[PDB]
């Protein structure tokens, strides 16, 4: 149906920008108009830019004139938008859609109908690496959970499961948070209670953008 | 910029009856504008047209009215599938700003959240680091402050907390207090303090531990 | 002495009207202390208790009156206990509730005294028929039954075949109307009843209007009286805590006056509190107010006249 | 003679309120006017409400006007008080006592005559619970005391006697103390010397609003 | 709200001669007070019904003044039954406030508190908790502040002190040091120290004991 | 509660020619607000009283405009008795709402902060506390952000900035970093670290001190 496959999940340090593929379908192009739209993650949405694919209207927002770029490539129903001068501030997804052409054969069109799935950029000059896992699991209390803590990876994101994914219930898998060195900081919680002294348990941590996997055994030290 | 206000920040209502929300404009928008349904990590589909007339892949309970100042989002049936943040978002003035967040969340009994209290690991204090975090787990509603003390004084630069989103089966919430300080700060110090406080405790639930305790 | 000599009657009744709390009638209005407030001056008070309820399990609506025979056997029990009462000399204290006991204790008392007037001081008519309501709400169809013009016209809905009509529409005085749906007033106009509502009541005067009312009920002969007295006819203002609330009712002031002329005419024969329920207010203030104000209006209605009231003996001594 | 015969010691969770009967008997009722104050323990008092029994003249307090509700019940001579919105400050003592009807048939009064004997009211929402006796009793000391911890009972009271209680000087039985998890905590102390070690001594519980009861034999362990 | 302000926090007065107290107004109440009885778990019965007149099954010894600012309270036959915590209470301003206190206690020779400290038990280590309590006995006046020590390190939020009143016979007084630690707590530790100080204790009053010593 | 926005947050125009500054409404107040004067901690006089017209006292050159949504106050001989925190303030809608801040600064050459750090005396250390601050001074415009650190590791919970007006003479800024510690953290570290960044500063304003070093 009417659809906007977009392309692609992509990091950039401070310096050149992500032309953000932005495919269309369904729909006759150049009856329409797509536009974008930012969301950093905890946060409202900000419009950023609209054209008319009908002829060439730029039609930019405002903090960014200037910063962004737009055009079409109605060969192929896809739309493109570049950024110039890129900034930690724009740690965002992009999303694209499609306002209706605002010319003169283009059908009314207020409300945003097509929406495309996204594009994870954030903007960080950091380096790929690898996590580092730093848990334990094993003072009076019945319920005892666990977990593991994931350290210092980038970029975004990592996957951890639980007796590889078979312990399930108790299994919360937690979103990052950016540091002060700009890497990024994770965790997973599980639940046992102080009745389950032979639970094996192990976080399976797996980073595929630096393609490295820990799986943590992990075991308290010696009582009494 | 006309900006869209939406009046319910937050929402947090059961499976069940009416969920009128609000939108306002600072002009007169004039039955131009829309509603939608974000998801999280997902497309934030339209819900209502223009101000009224429920779009083309709608259920059934979707009504809302306008026309042209202060806006009416309407969730009559709730359905619970529809809990995300919802936005309206003005249209016929350049340049088209949006609304501020809707977030419908589940209303059920509040709570008690979970707390305790973790050091680093000798794995860590090998690789030179110190990340003392505290755990937070299963509450309701969101809303926790928790402080930090070197052994009686406290703390920040390191200190942050990142919470989920409700749960599905038991409908909770969620928080660390995400803290990262240096092996040198750790070796000087022990007793590591923990100071929940949610609207279900009544005293701030301070959990704590001593450097070598555990 | 003739007046002042009171048997009470709680009936705790519903079923009439569809705001379901008006059973906690007589009870607050006895735990405000009516009893005591009327034993000050000469108030000969024998409580007889309140009356059974009995509950007709399929009580099955007629088409468009519903819950009938429980208000019909209310209704005849009441008429029972109120020609007790009036076979024992008193002023019949009969307060509920609500209006479809207004039935019995107005038949009851024609029992006795066949030649009666009656003042309906509240906000409507209630003189809906059971064929041409749109309700079907029996407390708002006791004038109906009573009045013998309307005889071969009302249905024999059940519970009611002991209903005789025994007061005739030249005999009955509408005070304090505010509210009529179009069936009952057609009856009121062509039926050629006098009434004084709040247009009428503001054109006169309050004094004027009871001094034409006692014209028209005891101008041509002394005759006992029977005031049937709601409290929704009184301002919500005052009684905010009542099953159907219309603003634009009397004051206070002039529903114990009405009560006052009443009782200055030494010819009160009957007497009906209805509607009053604690349990729509929406502070217990409302509550307070509300019940208060019936009370005093029953004290007033007895002679605890706002001139004063006395015990004949010197009192510099 | 001139009493007020309250009823009676209840407790409340936030919830629903504690109408207060207060019978009254002796003097002539509706000649005076019966008031209401709370006391908290370890405070002052607060005055609360003030009705005249003469006529319904409901006149209540600062800062609860609102929470309070104050009707009369004049054929048995009794008054009441409920409350709204209840609320963990309110543990308090209720008194009710007779200011006099402040209307115009009402003697000269200003001094509340009756008093009441109490009404025990704690708004708490802890559950009813049994007591845990916590002690011990046996390091150069001539004077050796002993006593027992009482922990996590609720509501109040427990009784703490001592050898069945013909241990009787040096037995000082103590107020308990309201948790920050809502529940209450207790001791005693008795004495004996370090002349006494054939002095078998126990405290000898009972919470009775939990029907529970613990006789706790004690004894130290081995030295040297 | 006029606060009603008594002079006399405390008392104690032997058997015998005249026990005045003091009842002081923010304002004018001008003879439209009472004066009070409260027995401990008792009705808190009138004694004097307008600032002067002695209502109603008075003895014979309650004579009190005032009229109207600083009021009175006089007690001129002691009588030790009387022995309770006393209250003014103005009346006539809303709302109607009330005094402090006006404890009645009884004075007698200063008695020196008997001081020992007594760990967890067995009973106790078998279910999990520590509550390590001493125990303060036969003395008089009432304040004495304990102190305790994690083998020379204070302690508290298990610490609990508690009194009660005095006593009929010997009229003396009461503490325990209530105090609630854990079993892990308890097992890392042994010198246990309870530090008594009372007005007859010069020196303030230690004993210890370590554990696994009795 | 119409939102009354001032467009102009700051100012800093010199001794001369017009001030003209913008507030508008979210409603029409249609020829009903006014314009006030608020110096620092005195009386906020009124310039202009319905819109235009010119108010009782007022010296020559405060004319404004407006009727009915974004109105004007133009100071066209602007006097430099003047600088003071604006506001608009409408009136004809309830509640009677005001504009945000409108501080008419100095506008002069931009000057540098002078900028060090300074640690707590022994005088403190006797007392027992830390109080590490760095003092800027002398610059021009006010925005400053000073970074603390632990020897290389940033600092809050005790940093706080407060800056002055302009100044009479020379027309400059202000701002301590106030940050206060313990004594214990004071002992364990020795290069604290105070980072100013101005806009005449291309690079952050770095100055240190180890303990024990002055
Ligand atoms: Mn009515
Ligand atoms: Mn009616």
Redesign the pocket.
């Known amino acids: 149906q009417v659809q906007l496959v977009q392309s692609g999940a992509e990091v950039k340090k401070p310096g050149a920008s992500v032309k953000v593929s932005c495919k269309a379908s369904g729909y006759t192009f150049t009856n329409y108009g797509i536009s974008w739209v930012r969301q950093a993650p905890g946060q409202g949405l900000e419009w950023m830019g609209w054209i008319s694919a009908y002829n060439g209207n730029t039609n930019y927002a405002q903090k960014l004139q200037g910063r962004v770029t737009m055009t079409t490539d109605t060969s192929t129903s896809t739309a493109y938008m570049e950024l110039r001068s890129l900034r930690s501030d724009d740690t965002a997804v992009y999303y694209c859609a499609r306002e209706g052409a605002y010319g003169y054969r283009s059908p009314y069109h207020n409300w945003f109908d097509p929406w495309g799935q996204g594009t994870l950029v954030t903007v960080s000059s950091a380096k790929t690496t690898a996590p580092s896992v730093y848990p334990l699991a094993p003072t009076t209390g019945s319920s005892v959970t666990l977990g593991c803590l994931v350290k210092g990876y980038f970029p975004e994101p990592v996957t951890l499961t639980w007796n590889s994914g078979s312990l399930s219930s108790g299994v919360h898998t937690f979103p990052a948070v950016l540091q002060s060195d700009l890497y990024t900081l994770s965790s997973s919680v599980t639940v046992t209670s102080s009745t389950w002294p032979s639970q094996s348990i192990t976080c399976n941590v797996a980073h595929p953008a630096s393609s490295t996997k820990v799986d943590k055994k992990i075991e308290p030290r010696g009582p009494t | 910029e006309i900006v869209m206000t939406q009046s319910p920040a937050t929402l947090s209502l059961s499976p069940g009856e009416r969920a009128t929300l609000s939108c306002r404009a600072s002009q007169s928008v004039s039955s131009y504008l829309a509603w939608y349904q974000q998801k999280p990590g997902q497309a934030p589909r339209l819900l209502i047209y223009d101000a009224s007339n429920r779009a083309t892949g709608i259920p059934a309970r979707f009504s809302g009215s306008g026309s042209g100042t202060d806006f009416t989002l309407t969730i009559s049936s709730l359905e619970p599938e529809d809990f995300a943040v919802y936005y309206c978002q003005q249209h016929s003035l350049l340049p088209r700003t949006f609304g501020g967040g809707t977030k419908v969340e589940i209303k059920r009994a509040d709570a008690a959240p979970t707390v305790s209290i973790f050091p680093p690991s000798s794995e860590q204090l090998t690789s030179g680091g110190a990340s003392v975090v505290c755990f937070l787990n299963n509450f309701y509603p969101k809303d926790i402050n928790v402080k930090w003390k070197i052994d009686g004084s406290e703390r920040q630069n390191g200190v942050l907390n990142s919470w989920t989103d409700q749960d599905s089966k038991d409908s909770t919430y969620s928080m660390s207090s995400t803290l990262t300080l240096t092996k040198d700060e750790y070796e000087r110090h022990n007793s590591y303090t923990c100071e929940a406080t949610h609207k279900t405790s009544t005293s701030p639930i301070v959990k704590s531990f001593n450097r070598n305790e555990c | 002495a003739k007046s002042r000599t009171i048997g009470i009657i709680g009936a705790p009744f519903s079923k009439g009207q569809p705001r379901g709390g008006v059973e906690e009638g007589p009870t607050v209005l006895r735990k405000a202390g009516l009893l005591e407030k009327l034993k000050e001056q000469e108030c000969d008070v024998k409580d007889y208790g309140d009356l059974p309820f009995a509950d007709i399990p399929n009580d099955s609506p007629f088409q468009i009156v519903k819950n009938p025979r429980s208000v019909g056997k209310a209704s005849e029990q009441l008429a029972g206990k109120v020609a007790e009462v009036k076979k024992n000399g008193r002023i019949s204290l009969v307060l509920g509730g609500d ?1 479809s006991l207004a039935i019995g204790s107005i038949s009851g008392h024609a029992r006795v005294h066949p030649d009666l007037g009656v003042i309906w001081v ?1 906000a ?1 008519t ?1 003189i809906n028929t059971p064929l041409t309501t749109t309700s079907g709400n029996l ?2 169809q006791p004038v109906s039954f009573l009045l013998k013009e309307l005889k071969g016209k009302i249905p024999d809905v059940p519970g009611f075949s002991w209903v005789t009509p025994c007061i005739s529409a030249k005999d009955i005085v509408y005070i304090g109307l505010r509210d009529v749906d179009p069936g009952e007033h057609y009856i009121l106009k062509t039926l050629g009843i006098k009434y004084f509502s709040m247009t009428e009541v503001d054109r006169l005067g309050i004094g004027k209007v009871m001094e034409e009312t006692l014209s028209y009920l005891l101008g041509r002969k002394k005759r006992p009286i029977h005031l049937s007295f ?1 409290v929704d006819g009184l301002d919500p203002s005052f009684t905010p805590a009542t099953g ?1 609330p219309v603003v634009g009712g009397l004051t206070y002031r002039e529903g114990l006056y009405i009560t006052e002329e009443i009782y200055k005419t030494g010819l009160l024969s009957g007497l009906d509190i209805m ?1 009053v329920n604690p349990s729509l207010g929406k502070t217990p203030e409302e509550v307070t107010r509300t019940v208060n104000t019936a009370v005093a209006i029953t004290l007033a209605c007895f002679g605890l006249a706002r001139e004063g009231n006395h015990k004949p003996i010197d009192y510099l001594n």
């Open positions: 209006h509240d409507h209630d407390h708002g709601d159907t509607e």
